[PDB]
Amino acid sequence: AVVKCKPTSPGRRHVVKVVNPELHKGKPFAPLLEKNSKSGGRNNNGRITTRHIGGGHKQAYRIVDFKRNKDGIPAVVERLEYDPNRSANIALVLYKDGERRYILAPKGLKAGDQIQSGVDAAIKPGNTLPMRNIPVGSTVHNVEMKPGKGGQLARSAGTYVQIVARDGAYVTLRLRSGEMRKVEADCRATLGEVGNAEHMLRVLGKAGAARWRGVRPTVRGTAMNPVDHPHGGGEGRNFGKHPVTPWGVQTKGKKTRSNKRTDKFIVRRRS
Amino acid sequence: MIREERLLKVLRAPHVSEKASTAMEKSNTIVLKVAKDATKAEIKAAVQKLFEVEVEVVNTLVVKGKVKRHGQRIGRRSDWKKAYVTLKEGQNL
Amino acid sequence: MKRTFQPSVLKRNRSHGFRARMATKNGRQVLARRRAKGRARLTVSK
Amino acid sequence: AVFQMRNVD
RNA sequence: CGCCGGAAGACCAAGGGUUCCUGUCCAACGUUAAUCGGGGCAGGGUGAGUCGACCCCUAAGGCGAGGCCGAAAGGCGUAGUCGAUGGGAAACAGGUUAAUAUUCCUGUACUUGGUGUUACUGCGAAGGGGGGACGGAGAAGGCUAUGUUGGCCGGGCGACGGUUGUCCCGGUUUAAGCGUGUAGGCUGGUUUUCCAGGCAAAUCCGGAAAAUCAAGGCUGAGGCGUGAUGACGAGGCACUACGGUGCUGAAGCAACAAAUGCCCUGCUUCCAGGAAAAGCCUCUAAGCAUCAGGUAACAUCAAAUCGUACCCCAAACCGACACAGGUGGUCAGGUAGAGAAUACCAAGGCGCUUGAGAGAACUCGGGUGAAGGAACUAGGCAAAAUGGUGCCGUAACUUCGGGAGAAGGCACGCUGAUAUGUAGGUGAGGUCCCUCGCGGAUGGAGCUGAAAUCAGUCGAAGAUACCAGCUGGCUGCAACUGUUUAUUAAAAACACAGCACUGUGCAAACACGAAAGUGGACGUAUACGGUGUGACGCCUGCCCGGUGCCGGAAGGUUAAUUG
RNA sequence: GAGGACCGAACCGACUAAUGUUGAAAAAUUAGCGGAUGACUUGUGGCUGGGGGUGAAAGGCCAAUCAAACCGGGAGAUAG
């Protein structure tokens, strides 16, 4: 339930906060917390391998149970909690043995829900069961790319992946990008979709809003110099040159992809 | 500990001064130079036998040698360790 | 105006101390030249 | 101080 | 006499390295003379179980057994190790020196270990859990540092009209520790049984069933006692190298105000969701199991090594100088005031290492000026002016927050009365209730104290000093807050949220690196990179010939290769 | 009690003008100014090393020097 900010002073007028009242305010479940120091975008060489990354508020990473290895055991939600690292909300479910692990939150999730991973598990949202048991066309997220590896697919908020086919050991998936890709049926996946569909609505609303996100200001290359960027000079803005990356790779209209090994999995290019 | 021979070199020379004389007539703490190393305990044992008097408490400090110079050439002196051996009611010489 | 020289003994020994010369093969060669040249101070410290 | 500038006549 | 007094006072770290103290000296050092000095020479000075370092632990990182990789040098990195700007046990008052004091002395203490005696008893990791362990902003409340007034004690009857009184001056200071556990804050406690969890196990944590009871516990300033029969103490008695040393030494209370300090690592609230490990509290395992060990009372021993002087916004550090520059943290008095602004003062430190004159131009820093009031000038440049609080009132326009303190005015001192000090705030005695405490109600003295009305009064001027917005209109540009050529350009330039295009399915694209390995990211197309444009509103037309690129695979053309 | 909110010290920044120009100072002082709860400032300690680094982009900055730092070497380079 987004609420547009009132125009009290500049840098506040355009802001649109995305409040989430059902979230449980308070200190995070401490033992699973661990350090996540900012890299600054630099590597071991100390070179800036990736620009426009630095600064921002400190963040603490939290482990999440992608594998859902505890099959059979019933689980119950305790409370939703904010995750700085990801657009998707995370929830601290309570296993019957008393063990606790974070999990991505399905749109149908509420406090006290009886979600349960397992091969024999009933088909309700929030469950994580292998796709071989999954009916065609159901909304699916957190799909493993490899058997038991975790679930790299559809981790982002509002994402969902339909399963349009099941022929062979593989099961075809419909990615949010619209790109088609085969995946083995043995891989685990979560039913339904993550509920943070309101995430796109945020618009920051000020120049300093990106500063805590670790984002750094972008300098266009036409404003630069020929020695620093291929674009530049010309005395008074200008342009002329065909657009390019600073390292000279052609921007706009050049597929940089070159994997070959994974082309077998690519049923179709994204549209 | 003793090892009598190590103890003997600790008491290389007494260090008389106008301030030290006041320490003996009032605080009853004899003042003398000691070895560059050693410890509070070894200095105490040196007084227990050779000075044949009981020690109350030992205190130590290190005065840095003042730099000297003559022309472009310079000549730093040498460091030495002062010590404060407080004496009990049994003090003599 | 602030001077370029802003002394700190802790930074000095870490950057220009005898230990830094031994940190790499290139640094050990630096000491070798000072010795053949003859010097009162192979490095600097206290 | 020496300065710089240019003598463009 | 004059200056600072949120410092030009005081302290620590950084850094400097005897500049500290004393005697003596004046060649050179000091922008002058110099008996003086941060100068020459010599002597003296730095006292630690509990201040800090060392030590234990860890961040960003560095190094790195093997290993991976690279012509060689070398690069990366595991287990490890190092790394404070962090965390981790414990000393406070008085006195003394020419210079050092939480170090020595005096008084009262405290922590962690070794050993011994006695009592009780399941003790034991590199492991599990708990704890340590943390954000921004805001709101007050309860207190202390500290201040004012009164009381008390000691001293003073005034160089000139008054001053034995409602007068003047000074003091009224006391810590750690220990006992007490309040103002508050947090949480329902105890017991029994069971478990797919916490790599092994578990009495601990967690989960599940019951029973019982309602206050069980933790945290916590400060106050009150003790510490304190003292110590300090204005001022005297006494010797006196006139630089001081011994002895004695009165009162040592109350009320109010009160913080930026404390309770507070709290509470409330908001996204931007807020280090790491050890010490510490517990749990067992491999084990010992009458032991060793564990806990408690007493006694004893040990707490080493190193720093400790001086300078600390400067004459000593950094600036070639005894240089109008630069340098982090801590201590925060009186009056006025919103205030750490500013003026005058306390404590305290200084009059800044050339002076004495003369009173020309001209120059620099200021004051005032009759008449005019931008006529000056590239240009209202510079000066001048506006300036506070309370109240009245305030247009076009707008994204309905603005514009706006728009503009434009009134009131402002002192004294009396309302009320010999009011509204309020603080709060004693008396009275009563108490599972009886640092209680509550009742009660209202005393103290403190604005703001207002009326009347009177003085000056040319009462926000009188310092302090302290000039305002309005049209328009260009950029949305705005910011950032930018350190050392001639602060802008229309850059950034900007937003919009769009394009690349990317994860061992991603991209980037560093001959590689290995990292970053992206411990992210997953609502994500990330690149490019363009630059809030918002109205929108964003046409052209693919040329150039670039995508898509397409027959044909034309064509390399190494085959010969 | 919200704000890259308002006035305004510390703090940070350096728009105007005078003085200074072998200055007290190889960029300061004086009288005004901007920001001052944040895209803030700063202490301490690390990281990126020369055709490279870093840059809210001035080709600025990298020890008073930067359209390619400094040191040593080739080197007594070449110079019609």
Numbering used by the authors:
A (entry chain BC): 2 to 272
B (entry chain BT): 1 to 93
C (entry chain B2): 1 to 46
D (entry chain B5): -8 to 0
Task: Show me the paper's own sentences about this structure.
However, in the presence of sub-inhibitory concentrations of ERY, ribosomes translating the ErmBL leader peptide become stalled, leading to an alternative stem–loop structure in the mRNA that exposes the RBS and start codon of the ermB gene and thus allows ribosome binding and induction of ErmB expression. Previous studies demonstrated that polymerization of the ErmBL nascent chain halts because the ribosome is unable to catalyse peptide-bond formation between the 10 amino-acid-long ErmBL-tRNAAsp (codon 10) in the ribosomal P-site and Lys-tRNALys (codon 11) in the A-site9. Here we present cryo-EM structures of the ErmBL-SRC in the presence and absence of A-tRNA at 3.6-Å resolution, which were used as a basis to perform extensive molecular dynamics (MD) simulations. In conclusion, this study illustrates how ERY exerts a dual effect on the PTC to inhibit peptide-bond formation, namely, by (i) restricting the path of the ErmBL such that orientation of the P-tRNA is perturbed and (ii) stabilizing the A-site crevice to prevent movement of the A-tRNA towards the P-site.
In silico sorting of cryo-EM images yielded two major homogeneous subpopulations of ribosomes bearing P-tRNA and E-tRNAs, but differing in the presence (termed ErmBL-APE-SRC; 85,393 particles, 33%) or absence (termed ErmBL-PE-SRC; 75,839 particles, 30%) of A-tRNA. Both subpopulations could be refined to an average resolution of 3.6 Å (using a Fourier shell correlation (FSC) cutoff of 0.143; Supplementary Fig. 2), with local resolution calculations indicating that the ribosomal core reaches towards 3.1 Å. Density is also observed for the lysyl moiety attached to the CCA end of the A-tRNA as well as for the ErmBL leader peptide attached to CCA end of the P-tRNA. In contrast to the previous study, the higher resolution achieved here enables us to more accurately place the CCA end of the A-tRNA and also to model the lysyl moiety, which was not visible before. Comparison of the position of the CCA end of the Lys-tRNA in ErmBL-SRC with the unaccommodated C-pmn and accommodated CC-pmn on the H. marismortui 50S subunit293031, as well as with accommodated CCA end of the Phe-tRNA in the T. thermophilus pre-attack complexes, suggests that the Lys-tRNA in the ErmBL-SRC is in a fully or near-fully accommodated state. In the ErmBL-PE-SRC, there is no clear density for U2506. However, upon binding of Lys-tRNA to the A-site, as in the ErmBL-APE-SRC, U2506 adopts a well-defined conformation, which is similar to that observed in the accommodated state. In both the ErmBL-SRC structures, the density for U2585 is weaker than other PTC nucleotides, but appears to predominantly adopt an intermediate position between the accommodated and unaccommodated U2585 states, hinting that the Lys-tRNA is not fully accommodated as suggested previously.
